[PDB]
Structure formats: C-alpha cells, structure tokens
C-alpha cells in the first residue's frame, strides 16, 4: 500500500495535481492509492478541487509506511526546507511528469521533480533536487541544473547551460546556448525575469530583465 | 443526425478544421456526421482542403434540426455578430479542442470556444463566450476570461489574470501573474501586441507593445 | 531490408535521435531496421547514447541498397553539402517527425526534414529541402519555406510568411503574419536573433535582434 500527496494547495499545487494524477493513474498504472493535498495553512481538513487537503501533522499521522510527496511550492527556499523535513520524517520525494512530458536519452533527474505537461528534457541532461519545470519549459542537450531550481512556464533553456542552485527562470525567458568549452552559467539564486533574452552569464544573486537581459535597476 | 461546420474558411478556419475533426471524429467518436465550412464570401459552393464550403444562406437551408458551428473568425466583433445570428437561428455553438488540448480541474468554458492543439487551461479557470485559444496558449490558475477574447498563438496568461471582453492578446505575449487580492486586469477591447511583456494592468481600449509593455505611440 | 542514420552526433543529433526512433519504431512500425549515427569527426566507431556512431566512409561501406539519412546538423551550408553528397551516393534523405508533431491539411515537405516534438505545420504550408523545425516551432497557414531553412526551438512563424533559402530563425522569435497580397518575406541567408519580434520584411543576409527587430549594430 502507498499514499501520495501534493504539498501546496495554492496555484502551483492545483495546476500540478492533474499531473500527479497522470503520473500515478497512467504512468504507474495505480488506480488504488489515495492522493491528497498537504497544506500547512489548514487546521481542519477541507477539500480542494475534490481532493482531501490536510496539514502536515495530519499527513504524518496517516498509518502508512509508504508515503510519496511532490512539493508544489514554487519558492525554492520553502521547497528545500520541506524536502529536508520529509526525508528526515522517512517520507519519499516523488517525481511527477505528465503524459506529454518528453524525456530523452541519458537524462538524470533527482527525486521530487515537478515536470509539467509539454516539458522536454533533452539529451544528456543532469538535474538536481526538486526541480520545477513548469508548462512548456525545455532543458536542451548537456545542461546541468542544480538543486531547487525553478522554471516558470515556457522557459527555453538551450544547450550547454549550467543553472546553479535556487535560480529562478521567469515565464518565456530565452537563454542562449553555451559551448562545451564555456557553458553559459546562471549563478546561484539568480532571477531571470519573464521575457528576458539572456545572451551572457548571469551572476549569482543577480536579477536580470529585458531584451537583451540587463541588471534590474 | 447532426451537421457540423467551421464558420470562416480563411487562415483561422483552415488551421482549425483539423482540430474540429479531432473534436468530432476522436473526442466525440462521430465518424457519421458531415462537417463543412461556412463562408459568406461564397456565392456558389466550392471545396476548401477537401471540405464542402458554402455561404450561411445554404447552411441554413440544410434540412437538419441539429447543427453545430465553431466560429473560426479571429475578429471578435464579427465573432459576436455571427454567434448572436446562429443562436437566433436555433443553431448550436460548438466548442472544439485538439487531442493535445489539456483541461485541468474545475474549468468552466462557454460553448463555442476554439481550443487549439497544445493549449492548456489550468485549474479553476472561468472562460466566457466564443474564446479563441490559438496554438500553444495557456490560461493558468484562477483566471477569469470574459466574452469574445482572442489569443494569438503561444500566449502565456499566468495565474490570477482577468481579461475583459473583446481583448486581443498577440503572439508570444507574456502576462505577469496577479494575486488573489489584486488580479491583473486586461481591460475591455485592449490589444496586447505580439511579444509584449505585460507587468501591469492594461487599460480598456489600450494598445501595448514591447518589453516592458508600453502604450503604442 | 533498410538501414537508418542520424548524420551528426553532437547536440542537434543527440536531441533528434529519440525523434528518429519515434519516426522509425512507431510511425513506420519498424522494430527490425538498425539506426546509427554518422559523424565525420570519428576515425574508429564509438557509441553515443547506446547507438553505434561511425564516419561516412564506414556508413557507405555498409552492404545495403536501402539507406535513409536524417541530417541533424543545424548549419544549413553543411546540411546542403551533406544532402548533395548523400543523393549523389544513392542514399535517401529521410524526414523524421515526433509522435507529438502535428501536420495539418495540404502540407508539402521535401524529404529530409527534421520535425521535432511539439511542432505544428499548419494548413496549406509548402516547405523545401532539409528543413529544421526544432522543438515547439510552428509554421502557420499559407507559408512558403525555402531550402535549408533552420528554426531554433519555439519559433512562431505566423501565416503568409515566405522564408527564403538558408535563413536561420532563433529561439522564441515571433514573426508577424503577412497578407495574401503582401507575404512577409525573410530574405535569403537572413538571421533572426533569439527573442526577436519581427514586424517587417527582413532583407537577404540581414541579422536582426530585439523588440522590435532592428539590424544588429
Ligand atoms: C502560473 C504562474 O503564474 S507561474 C508565475 C510566473 N511568473 C513569472 O514568470 C513572473 C516572474 N517575475 C518577474 O519577471 C518580476 O517582474 C521580476 C522578478 C523581474 C521583478 O519583480 P519586482 O522586483 O516585484 O518588479 P515590479 O513588478 O515591482 O516591477 C519593477 C519594474 O520593472 C518592470 N518589470 C518587472 N518585471 C519585468 C520584466 N520581466 N521585464 C521587463 N520589465 C519588468 C516593471 O514594469 C516595473 O517598472 P516601473 O519601474 O516602470 O514601475
Ligand atoms: C496564425 C496567425 O498568423 S494568428 C495572427 C497572429 N498575429 C499577431 O499576433 C500580431 C499581433 N499584432 C501586432 O502585434 C500589431 O503589430 C499591433 C496590433 C501591435 C500594431 O499593429 P499596427 O498598428 O497595424 O502596427 P504596424 O504594423 O503599422 O506598426 C506600427 C509600428 O510599431 C512597430 N510594432 C508593431 N507591432 C509591434 C510589436 N508587437 N512589438 C513591437 N513593435 C511593434 C512596427 O514595427 C511599427 O514601427 P515603425 O513605426 O518603426 O514603422
Ligand atoms: C538546443 C539549442 O541550443 S539550438 C540553439 C538555439 N540558439 C539560438 O537561438 C541563439 C541564436 N543566436 C543569436 O541570437 C545570436 O546571439 C545572434 C546570431 C543574434 C548574434 O550572435 P553574435 O553575433 O555571435 O552575437 P554576440 O553573442 O557576440 O553578441 C553581440 C551583442 O548583441 C547582443 N545580443 C546577441 N544576441 C542577441 C539577441 N538575440 N537579442 C538581443 N541582443 C543580443 C549581445 O548581448 C552582445 O551585446 P554587447 O555588444 O552588449 O556585448
Ligand atoms: O511551509 C509551508 C509554506 C507554504 N505552504 C503552502 O504552500 C502554498 C503555496 O504558497 P504560495 O502562494 O507562496 O506558493 P505557490 O502556489 O505559488 O507556489 C500555500 O497554500 C501555503 O499555505 C505550506 O503548506 N507550508
Ligand atoms: O460575416 C462574415 C465575416 C467574415 N467571414 C469570413 O471569415 C473569414 C475570415 O476573414 P479574415 O481573413 O478577416 O479572418 P481570419 O481567418 O484571420 O480570422 C473570411 O474568409 C470571410 O469571408 C464570413 O464568412 N462572414
Ligand atoms: O561535414 C561534417 C560537418 C559536421 N559534422 C558533424 O556534425 C556535428 C554537428 O556539428 P556542430 O556542433 O557544428 O553542429 P550541431 O550539433 O549544433 O548542429 C559535429 O559532431 C560534426 O563532427 C559531420 O559529421 N560532417
Ligand atoms: Cl510552446
């Protein structure tokens, strides 16, 4: 027996629950296991879009040794804190992908990724902990994505790009390919704004916007 | 018995007819009913891409009580005029979606929408009359789309956005999320240009272009 | 009997090999024929992502009358040189598309196209020799694409656009529709930069960037 959950019942979680259902019902062929929302805003259980939603205290109390959780919270510092709590409590992080999520050859993705519909992870890609690839995003050949990286929808991450931990890439941003000799680096905790056209390395902690991408003033 | 049509045999209709065929042949499992084009430019019937195409006078004359029409005319003032004519004539508006159109939980869409391939309508979205969602567009969580709204291809409509009646959103435009306390409003009859990066409310009747979006001068 | 290959085992080829496998194993229903990489950087054969990879001398030496090659080299002058060599050697150019590639009515595509996943080729489109349509690109109604044209991922090529030979369209670029009376022309060997918003004809050999697109200075 197993129990599944989506941690976060706000906009991120509500648009991931259908994906978690494709993962569980179709890709794992599991029509038996329950799936719920976990949300720490809750005191008493409620329902969200026809799913039971409970706080983490109540989820822990469920008498099952085999719990699997997708963290659907876009803020990556919260996501890391939750992931460390879940692993410490003996709960498994659970990667979810949609029926239209495309994974190519020699891809490595750490447990707990949220891979939305129409996402492509292309050849020879390595991805770290609890990656969020929102709708239509791609990661192309030979990229290395670090831990707790977050893509908004429709991110174009071209080949030979290294995105360091906790970076955020905004809606529709486009990133120029690197080369094998010089991968294009998005630094730790950088924020690439929606619609940014990134042609050069982004420093750690920088916020860049515009076409072409410049530091936000 | 039933008869189906795509109203408009120009570029919009010709790229929607295959979608109307996925809707009818696969999603409704209907291999019997005829589907035609209606176009008021026609005097004598012609064929368009192997489909009979006729004017509305001839379509009305068809002796069938059960007619279903998708309006494939991008101009929303024409679309409203046609929709009101069809309903007055006792003809049903017909929503079409592709095999790759993704609809999530608790979505409401008024009859007569044209939902193209690779479109996502995410959680808890409400959409009004004869919506056009062209190829690759998405509407994310908790959006409210009004009547006769038109998306070009690849529109990124993020969460908590309210698009009022007759707005037009151009190819590849990206719209920043609102919040539940302050939804981001695109005003009635506004035009968001192709590639616009919208970070703020757009006034009724405004035309905005650029990154970031500004009034067209 | 037949043998298949992807010519180019770098990033372009490695992200096309899974597509060539969808084309061969699923769309042609062929679980028998071998598929390999050809790459002229090789002296001795190697393996790339679990596929035999050999130089063109070794591929020619294979005793099979029935060879089919997809050229997965983005540089269109190299692609033309290879295509002419293959045809002169009596080897067939091979169009590949993914399971999620959408082709609409009355489309003509010359042999040897690389049509990636999530690509749409819409109604009444004509495409010339060895077209590259990378991930998520579309070509909308009544376009004419010439020979050895290359789209990066997520190109939005709207209706009534004529793209002349050897043009390159960069990641996420958006091109305004033409009209039947005035198709919007992208000239021979033009380069449209990633994220460019093209609202006007692009001269032959021009390099354009930005929103709106201007000559690169
Ligand atoms: C389904 C979903 O909804 S997932 C959510 C997806 N959302 C996104 O991708 C949005 C990502 N966020 C952004 O791009 C943000 O705008 C940021 C991070 C770049 C800036 O955020 P803030 O610092 O809060 O910026 P704020 O909104 O106050 O605007 C700052 C200024 O920069 C401009 N600006 C903000 N974002 C951008 C952008 N992406 N491109 C160009 N200009 C921008 C604003 O218009 C404003 O201009 P002003 O000085 O003329 O008023
Ligand atoms: C399958 C299909 O084809 S569906 C059709 C999809 N099509 C689209 O999404 C296009 C949507 N339309 C647009 O973006 C239009 O360009 C509009 C509505 C913003 C402006 O239209 P018009 O007022 O007719 O603008 P026009 O083409 O005359 O150009 C006005 C000026 O603004 C510039 N411009 C026009 N559109 C844009 C844009 N989206 N972004 C930046 N600049 C623009 C033009 O280059 C021109 O500049 P100039 O003064 O240097 O000559
Ligand atoms: C899976 C894959 O990876 S497929 C590969 C997909 N890749 C792409 O689509 C990238 C297409 N290429 C481009 O857009 C290129 O940047 C080109 C062709 C426009 C310019 O290339 P180059 O001439 O080598 O430009 P370079 O990178 O030296 O930059 C020139 C200047 O223009 C700026 N720039 C470059 N490209 C762009 C762009 N697309 N938009 C705006 N500005 C740009 C650069 O930041 C640089 O600015 P600086 O003068 O401030 O330093
Ligand atoms: O420690 C936490 C932090 C946040 N949340 C929930 O995560 C959801 C997501 O919150 P937010 O709107 O910040 O993020 P989003 O849905 O956009 O990622 C909210 O319902 C929070 O109550 C939680 O359950 N535990
Ligand atoms: O009252 C109308 C108005 C327009 N059209 C047809 O709708 C099609 C679409 O016209 P247009 O090119 O303006 O729009 P699009 O295909 O881009 O939406 C044309 O063939 C028109 O003849 C029609 O049949 N009746
Ligand atoms: O005549 C040629 C030219 C190039 N290549 C190979 O094509 C691949 C693609 O090279 P490049 O990185 O220039 O292009 P991409 O993968 O981006 O198209 C490389 O492995 C080259 O060795 C080849 O086999 N024969
Ligand atoms: Cl897309």
Author numbering:
A (entry chain AAA), B (entry chain AAA), C (entry chain AAA): 2 to 218
List passages from the publication reporting this PDB structure.
The crystals utilized for the investigation belonged to the space group R3 with one subunit in the asymmetric unit. The overall architecture of the subunit is distinctly bilobal with an N-terminal domain delineated from Ser 2 to Ser 93 and the C-terminal domain formed by Leu 94 to Ala 218. The C-terminal domain displays a classical left-handed β-helix motif with six complete turns. The acetyl-CoA moieties are wedged between the subunits of the trimer. There is one cis-peptide bond between Asn 212 and Pro 213.
Utilizing the published genome sequence of the organism, we hypothesized that the genes 0612, 0638, and 0637 encode for a 4,6-dehydratase, an aminotransferase, and an N-acetyltransferase, respectively, which would be required for the biosynthesis of one of the diacetamido-sugars, 2,4-diacetamido-2,4,6-trideoxy-d-glucose, starting from UDP-N-acetylglucosamine. In this report we present functional and structural data that demonstrate the proteins encoded by the 0638 and 0637 genes do indeed correspond to an aminotransferase (hereafter referred to as Pcryo_0638) and an N-acetyltransferase (Pcryo_0637). The data presented herein confirm the hypothesized functions of these enzymes and provide new insight into an unusual sugar biosynthetic pathway in Gram-negative bacteria.
